[PDB]
């Protein structure tokens, strides 16, 4: 919404840049004007053949007499028109180079200045300006927004003026050559603008319906693939597939309806557009029979107007490119034009010599940019005598850290003054002030260069001697010399990450080359290891003694030797003095001392598509007919002008043009019929395989075991995405792109034959010219993409050192050295600058060539079409036919290169979709094999079980686990932590087979048992029960599948679960909908329902996995009261964390490092004193 003045945007264009754009836009207008003139000559060539075509047939008496005056007229006329033609091609060759080169030249020159001025402006802002902004968005604003500006001031403006030239020039030649046909052509324009306006309303409203249609199926997939362990445990994998298959069945019905209506729309609009033209052209014929327009003049206006009409559309993108570049330049120039109060680039203010360093802070009130919300310094008073070292102490707020901020004048104070020596800080030059102030901050930062360079960031003029004495005076010399490569080592976020106490020591050495008169040490010892803290602290004490120093830390070790100590309370300075006096005061300081003491040939995807042997042959045969039918419109147009030029006697003409215009309309409707058929067949053929694919994928997805769903690669979102994308993509490859790719090869094929058998060698010539201008058009785009990737790689190096400069900014400005990053950025940009100059010459050459190759190609079409061809007993009516046939057949092959990525993007989406079906699990619930024992009573034997999780085979959970539990008794499961308590329940559900050892139930190893039948006897209840969106009766009936559960049966379980108070209280009762779609209830009710579905199954085994995890107050007392009643009649395993509710258990087992450690009844483990006694004691006392 915000934008920029047009002149301010070009403020960096001066002298030559203003000229380049002028010559550029000039040649751009010359370029545009060239085309409607080229079509104007196409009319004069018609009248030459028409004056001879009428007189050649007017004879029927003399033959050799027509070999003289006709051929002479043709000789003088065709050589004239061909000479003019060769002239236009040389013109476009020059102006197209001038057009693109000059504009790209002005673009590159300015963006170089923009980028330099922009980065210079970024470094000029004061710190308060950064505290209110996002540096990441700013740096992306530096590289992205400058690109948008370049796109708008580049050759796009030349294209814009070239287009308006065609538009004006087309309608000038239109109006002058004929004021009637133009008004007629404009009269049908609203119909064309109205038919394509039905497209913007149908697409935008139906693209939502499909994104709404699958959103109903993808919601099933989401709540399924999120609750996968629950459907796996309850075996609803046939139902959850059925529901998805039922929503897939609706999405395909809405997809064929959209296929019916959209193909009805596309054909009807195409028929309206082609009927609109043919009326304007048949109207053209109605004015030649009246001797008011020449048959060649009808063409000149009909082409020039339609050319200029579409030139409007071909200019609209360049308008948006310029406008976006304006609005992109707003926030950029706003930074360049913003002027600071602090500067630091300013050459102003005093530079005191012999600074003795007597600092004082006077009545300083301050607040950081969070402004009226907080005021961190309510008044202040502090002097620090020269040579002395004052220490600032404080409980919190870190108003301590604020004085160092003000002392460098990173901010100016709200009220009061900071005075270095006797002068106010604001009277001294900002840069010189920061140069007489050395800073060592808590988190030290080193830039990605050599140590000597990072030390060189203290002072640019320095020799390895001073670097050596600096690091040796910080006792940082001993440890870097042992490091390889000496001073030439590397540091940064990338490479050679060092110890913190060593980085701080380089920072002290960096600040030491500064030889500052003032020193500020902010928590430089804080947050550092204890051993190296002394190594650095010795350098700090050796860094002072020559300077006046303010130091802030929470280490009361460094503070004793300070000549003065200062305490803060609420931004108010409270206590000050030597260490002993503060202890005698027994105030804030004394208080704190005591406290601290693969693209491949995939045919099988088409073999699945072979489910429909028809519907394809219908469309292909229909598309090839439509292919063969398109050039027949060019044949008609050829003979509507052909018989009109080859007329002779004029009486028969008027009756013939009516017959032709009639047949064309019969051919257009027969094209509409074959277009609605080739679009509906492919549409319905691609919609059913979308169901088959999403069905077979979602089926195979439910086949995999919990091992697969645990993968970080496969999350519920990444699976639904993989589920939607791959299925839609393969529909496109077998969809419209194929029907079109066959219609077009049929369109060229049926066009090439007609042209070949008519004009001999005429076609053989055009087939030499067209593939070259097409390849030359392709190679230009390859060079275009090559130049694009290269410059992206080069400015990336510049923006990389821009990222470093602005992300670590508050440090660089503390060290000054901002001019350094400017020059580095300038040198980095100097390569893309000289690159951008060559770009203009390249872009201009390629564009001018592809334009010249099209115009010279046109000259070859007629100079050969006349002369050698028409000096033969030939037919001009054929030369026009081969032009339209071949050129349109070629431009229809131009659609092959556009649908090429639709094939690759689909094969890649097919690559994953064929493997996701074929991948097989280790535990497949689908296998019907397995024993299915007949004996009811349930035991469980864990024997020597070692288990590791396939995602994390590092820390083991189960090592040699061994349990046993008889029928009808409760096995309590206590654990120090982790899923060692929970993995038991997962292995019994056989979510995994154990690595070593085995687990039996009735004595049969579950590994040889039937996987589904096994889980069918298990009453799993977990921490967070997930309930799908449906009737609670259904969430309950989910406990028993392969059979519909009775109402009184799901009542009995709801009675059992003590949830009946809700189920009757509701208005809908058992038919109420749950799942945060229809209704919402608290967790206690959700769990009771999960208990109900658990025992709707009537299992012989309950599995209560911390069932009271998330619960509170009376809700726990009522849920535990339901679980306690659900067991005692069944085999049970309870890992619940309530050991008070575990007291009445038949056997309590303590898990330790995967081994069983203690086990026995409650009082038995209470008699022993150890882990279980400690577990019961710790949470009964607390
Ligand atoms: Br009659 C007649 C035939 C083709 C005409 O232009 C074309 C041409 Br040329 C090709 C195709 Br496809 C469709 C149309 Br409409 C005109 Br205008 C009038």
Residue numbers in the entry: 30 to 626, 689 to 1273
The authors write:
The multidrug transporter P-glycoprotein (Pgp)/ABCB1/MDR1 plays an important role in multidrug resistance (MDR) and detoxification owing to its ability to efflux an unusually large and chemically diverse set of substrates. P-glycoprotein (Pgp), a member of the ATP-binding cassette (ABC) superfamily, is one of the most promiscuous drug transporters in nature and is capable of binding and expelling a very large number of substrates from the cell. The structures highlight a high concentration of aromatic residues in the transmembrane α-helices that form the DBP, many of which are directly engaged in contacts with ligands. The binding mode of the environmental pollutant BDE-100 in the DBP of Pgp was also previously captured by XRC and it was shown to be a potent inhibitor of verapamil-stimulated ATPase activity of the transporter.
A close inspection shows that the Phe979 side chain in the other structures appears to be just outside van der Waals contact distance with the ligand (not shown), and therefore it does not appear to contribute much to the binding energy. BDE-100 binding to the F979A mutant was indistinguishable from that to the parent C952A mutant, but the F724A mutant lost BDE-100 binding at site 1 and gained binding at a third site (site 3) that was formed at the pseudosymmetric axis of the DBP. Furthermore, we detected no significant differences in the binding pose of BDE-100 in site 1 between the Y303A, Y306A, C952A or F979A mutants. All structures were determined in the 3.98–4.17 Å resolution range and adopted the same inward-facing conformation as wild-type Pgp.
